[PDB]
Amino acid sequence: DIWTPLESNPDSLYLYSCKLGQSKLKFVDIYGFNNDLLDMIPQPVQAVIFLYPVKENFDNVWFIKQYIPNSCGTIALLHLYGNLRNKFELDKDSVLDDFFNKVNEMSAEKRGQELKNNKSIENLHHEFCGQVENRDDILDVDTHFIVFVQIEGKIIELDGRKDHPTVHCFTNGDNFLYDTGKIIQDKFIEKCKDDLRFSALAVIPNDN
Template identity: 35%
Template structure:
């Protein structure tokens, strides 16, 4: 089961040009300029396309992979869909909740799921990413470190610097905002030996079993295939990874 090239216009949802959180185009060019503008050095990490789920395509992906970002069609029933082996963290699992950086996507954040996926990717790889001191991301993560997912969402919605950066990234895409189709972003990360799916539309992180820094990309393939099978009548899927640059 192959994934289309990132030349396919993909974003989070249709939006007006005046919206505070318009959709982001799902391309490495857009996400790289976005994450670098927020305070991640260009020589530190980089987003890359994943062109297929077969072994040959996965072998082409630069390692080490810190996070995987999937953009996929978001039909109404997707919010209630269940995928194999998923286990939503419950509020009582306080220790695990504190270990996984998660932001809830509240209604006022509109089409910010691309930015939330980026924050999930970097926020859960903070020990491997060298943020510029006092940059937008550095201040954001320091300010929200002790907040719960909803409080982080409220903080993000009010963060004018982040909103301006998001708008610039949205305008950097090659696709007109009015032409973008309804899509949604989720992020996959590994934390303490476990694979987590981070979807701001869900109530919390979803556990998908054992994982390691070496096997992250391979471990996420069955989950992605299950998502694709659940939406069989669409080809609008795009997969990217956030990889650390070897120095």
């Protein structure tokens, strides 16, 4: 049971979200993590999605375990809209609204198993996945999506391969994008002993 990696292009992510039941949030490329470039990002930033190669009470954070290779794009969208549900509501009776209601009382483990059995999402996923010319486009699981969201003034990193969310530090609206950049630089970029070709996206409101 293997999936085609999700296309990370901001337009494809949006369109994919629209079909899943969320049209209120959009994605904007992050060109770098220095202040100059982060200043270019429109605010308020609601989250940051990050792609790269290869206390603990989480009562208030929605978490799903990842069991399927290259489903991570979708897991990230799940972690994203699932934790912004109060602020940006899902379309009533949409694929995601239905999924979140169905798994609301489930643990991160059973949530993850439910994903396996969700035809709609798997189908919609592979309408917004990358192209495949050869097996190395689906069997090469090298790049990985993770997401950072602000939950009760705390920067929470959400990754389905880990056993739980990773709580980082306190923050606020104004500072979230910047505190997040510092975390990404020290935890992933500079910690990597090479030219870490990453990509990043800020999630912002579609309107105001």
